[PDB]
């Protein structure tokens, strides 16, 4: 029936934030809510005349209706083409791959699972730009501001386009191209790893399967790549997990793939992958550099040192990896409690790590627990845990950080118990490419032995959450198999005393311990 203007009135918090806009499903279902936000996104694209927009999601209730509205508004925008997943399915690494391959203007990912942290049951709309990665803050603020001042939006009224079978289909002047959700992405992964040799180590079935991000071993992408392509037994893809550190403590007929999966923390997994990267096709020539978010443990640092490559320390976010990967300063990167990835895409990638690991296991022909034990043997172990103090009263948390910041200059050089202070600062990051400076990114106590304490404040705007990161470095192999909270007891006592956590927040116990 054609292009129409639809009058609308603004909504209140269409402010995206880190992983795009996340709200309960009834909130996105409000009349014109999705349309307002999607109009705000499209209003940041100035010359859509010949461009392509990537669109997909994860199945979840409401995705189907949303994908139809987005398609219809894209048609009204004037995009040449929308590459949309079969049945509206596209993972975040896939969309990043697809955007990058075909030079698309950007994408819209309908997911709230790539990032597990968040109220479960929420609906999410993520906007990725031309480089294949998340939209920078300058762009998400732009969207939020537009969402507050819009009087109308444009949409192409027409009946829904079927996405069950592949092909090109007309919608206005626009092409709706339905793509195999996995083909391009599996291709990229095949350029990175020896799929043949990963099939073998699955065949023999004597080793466990290792992963470092939640949900990496679930869903259609794991199913098609691990099960139908690489020959993993049915049932391998959905606790069903054992922790790598448990298997290392234990060190002191049936297939193992199909059994439990070994979880390695992103902090340690990033170090190990970087240490064994030259065993796989995708990184034979070596790494350009490593990057990690500041609170991620220093495990990868010690590998970069011995390798002779630089290691960048960025503020929390897969945001800041983008400029370093594009510039070629960095090949591998990871984020504590989120996962790992490389420059093959611009987002965290859970299968990419699972396959990486499977390819490491096939070449070195040895179980995970022993690989980890060797890594610690060679580089030392970076004992690492986070303590979360959730829902601190607003400005009590800000008094804590303020009092601590004041004390930091006099901390330098002093010896507190067993730990001598080498650096006590407020983290700031100056981008080696943008020259954009980020400030107040957290308080660091860095000790001369390699150990570390870090304080950050989260959820400012909401209660606030105090996150305390505890890192003890242990070079002695005889000391590398303790319980993390036992190993970290002395650092935990120090972190609490110097910041006066109990005195200024009234909390005797972390809300969460990881």
Automatic annotation (TrEMBL):
UniProt record, GO biological process: glucose metabolic process
This protein's record includes keyword Metal-binding: yes
Molecular-function GO term, any one: magnesium ion binding
Listed InterPro entries: A-D-PHexomutase_a/b/a-I, A-D-PHexomutase_a/b/a-I/II/III, A-D-PHexomutase_a/b/a-II, A-D-PHexomutase_a/b/a-III, A-D-PHexomutase_C_sf, A-D-PHexomutase_CS, Alpha-D-phosphohexomutase_SF, PGM
GO cellular component labels: cytosol
Any one Pfam family match given in the protein's UniProt record, by short name: PGM_PMM_II
Keyword terms: Carbohydrate metabolism, Glucose metabolism, Isomerase, Magnesium, Metal-binding, Phosphoprotein
Region feature (Disordered): 1-21
Enzyme Commission designation: 5.4.2.2
Catalytic activity annotation: alpha-D-glucose 1-phosphate = alpha-D-glucose 6-phosphate
Enzyme class, first EC level, given as a word: isomerase
PANTHER family: PHOSPHOGLUCOMUTASE, PHOSPHOHEXOMUTASE FAMILY MEMBER
Protein's recorded name: phosphoglucomutase (alpha-D-glucose-1,6-bisphosphate-dependent)
Organism for this UniProt entry: Thermosynechococcus vestitus (strain NIES-2133 / IAM M-273 / BP-1)
Lineage: Bacteria, Bacillati, Cyanobacteriota, Cyanophyceae, Acaryochloridales
């Amino acid at each position: 029936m054609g292009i129409q203007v639809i009058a609308t009135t603004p909504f209140k918090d269409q402010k995206p934030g880190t992983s795009g806009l996340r709200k309960p499903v009834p909130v996105f279902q409000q009349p014109h809510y999705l349309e307002n936000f999607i109009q705000a996104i499209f209003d940041t694209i100035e010359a859509p005349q010949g461009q392509t927009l990537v669109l997909g999601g994860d199945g979840r209730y409401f995705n189907a209706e949303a994908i139809q509205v987005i398609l219809k508004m894209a048609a009204a925008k004037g995009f040449a083409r929308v590459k949309v997943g079969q049945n509206g399915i596209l993972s975040t690494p896939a969309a990043s791959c697809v955007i990058r391959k075909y030079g698309a203007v950007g994408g819209i990912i309908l997911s709230a699972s790539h990032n597990p942290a968040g109220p479960q049951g929420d609906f999410g709309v993520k906007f990725n730009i031309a480089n294949g990665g998340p939209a920078p803050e300058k762009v998400t603020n732009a969207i939020y501001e537009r969402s507050l001042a819009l009087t109308h939006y444009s949409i192409y009224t027409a009946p829904d386009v079927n996405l069950h079978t592949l092909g090109e289909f007309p919608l206005g002047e626009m092409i709706v191209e339905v793509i195999d959700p996995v083909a391009d992405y599996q291709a990229l992964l095949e350029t990175l790893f020896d799929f043949d040799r990963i099939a073998e180590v699955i065949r023999t079935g004597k080793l466990r399967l290792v992963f470092d991000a939640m949900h990496a071993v679930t869903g259609p992408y794991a199913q098609q790549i691990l099960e139908k392509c690489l020959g993993a037994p049915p049932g391998t893809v959905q606790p069903n997990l054992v922790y790598a550190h448990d298997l290392v403590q234990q060190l002191f007929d049936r297939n193992m793939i199909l059994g439990a999966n070994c979880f390695v923390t992103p902090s340690d997994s990033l170090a190990i992958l970087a240490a064994n990267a030259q065993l796989v096709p995708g990184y034979r020539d070596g790494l350009a550099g490593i990057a990690r978010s500041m609170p991620t443990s220093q495990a990868a640092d010690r590998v970069a040192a011995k390798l002779g490559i630089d290691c960048y320390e960025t503020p929390t976010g897969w945001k800041f990896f983008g400029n370093l990967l594009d510039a070629g300063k960095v090949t591998l990167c990871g984020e504590e409690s989120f996962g790992t990835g490389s420059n093959h895409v611009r987002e965290k990638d859970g299968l990419w790590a699972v396959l990486f690991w499977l390819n490491i296991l096939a070449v070195r022909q040895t179980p995970v627990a022993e690989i980890v034990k060797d890594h610690w043997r060679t580089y030392g172990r970076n004992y690492y845990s986070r303590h979360d103090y959730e829902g601190i009263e607003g400005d009590r948390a800000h008094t804590l950080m303020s009092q601590l910041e004041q004390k930091l200059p006099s901390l330098v050089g002093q010896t507190l118990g067993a730990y001598t202070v080498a650096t006590a600062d407020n983290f700031s990051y100056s981008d080696p490419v943008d020259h954009s400076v980020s400030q107040n990114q957290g308080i660091r106590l860095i000790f001369e032995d390699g150990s570390r304490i870090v304080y950050r404040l989260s959820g400012t705007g909401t209660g606030a959450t105090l996150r305390v990161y505890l890192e003890r470095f242990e070079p002695h192999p005889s000391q590398q198999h303790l319980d993390a909270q036992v190993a970290l007891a002395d650092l935990i006592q120090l972190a609490n005393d110097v910041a006066n956590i109990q005195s200024l927040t009234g909390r005797d116990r972390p809300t969460v311990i990881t």
